Amino acid sequence: VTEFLKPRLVDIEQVSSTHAKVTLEPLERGFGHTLGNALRRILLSSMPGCA
């Protein structure tokens, strides 16, 4: 239909208030990998802060 699926996320678990665990569901056949990998590669290197 040329219109994709958008997730109905289920949980933002905030254990220890500094180590969170987010779930997201559902995503298309391969969008899980691409979104996870893009977010991971951006957060690791290209995410400004101060140190």
Partner: peptide
């Protein structure tokens, strides 16, 4: 997510 979307902004239509 915001940084990636504002990177993408140059190509999308809507």
């Amino acid at each position: 997510a915001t940084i990636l979307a504002e990177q993408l902004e140059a190509f999308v239509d809507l």
